[PDB]
Design a binder for these strands. Sequence first.
DNA 1: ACCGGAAGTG
DNA 2: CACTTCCGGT
Length: 88
Amino acid sequence: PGSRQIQLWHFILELLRKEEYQGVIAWQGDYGEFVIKDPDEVARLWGVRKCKPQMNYDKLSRALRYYYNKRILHKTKGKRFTYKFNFN
DNA sequence: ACCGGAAGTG
DNA sequence: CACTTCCGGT
């Protein structure tokens, strides 16, 4: 059709614009910054969505680190599980 | 917890 | 490609 596979940063935003996932992941601090409150839950869902049952935060976080070079994401240093989108 | 290299997947 | 898997560092 024109369908690519579901990107992880698509999937993070999908969750982050839904109040029914605030317990798991939410916006915090500055503009574009977010926090994972339940790292193991996020990964489980990202495993469910990609039919990859052995997914976990170690593997998911690697995925996120590959976004640093690509200028989609980066880390907020000091704050745990706190990344921030590159909207500039 | 967080990093990044390296090989593997489809 | 866009991750997944694995794992040796700080």
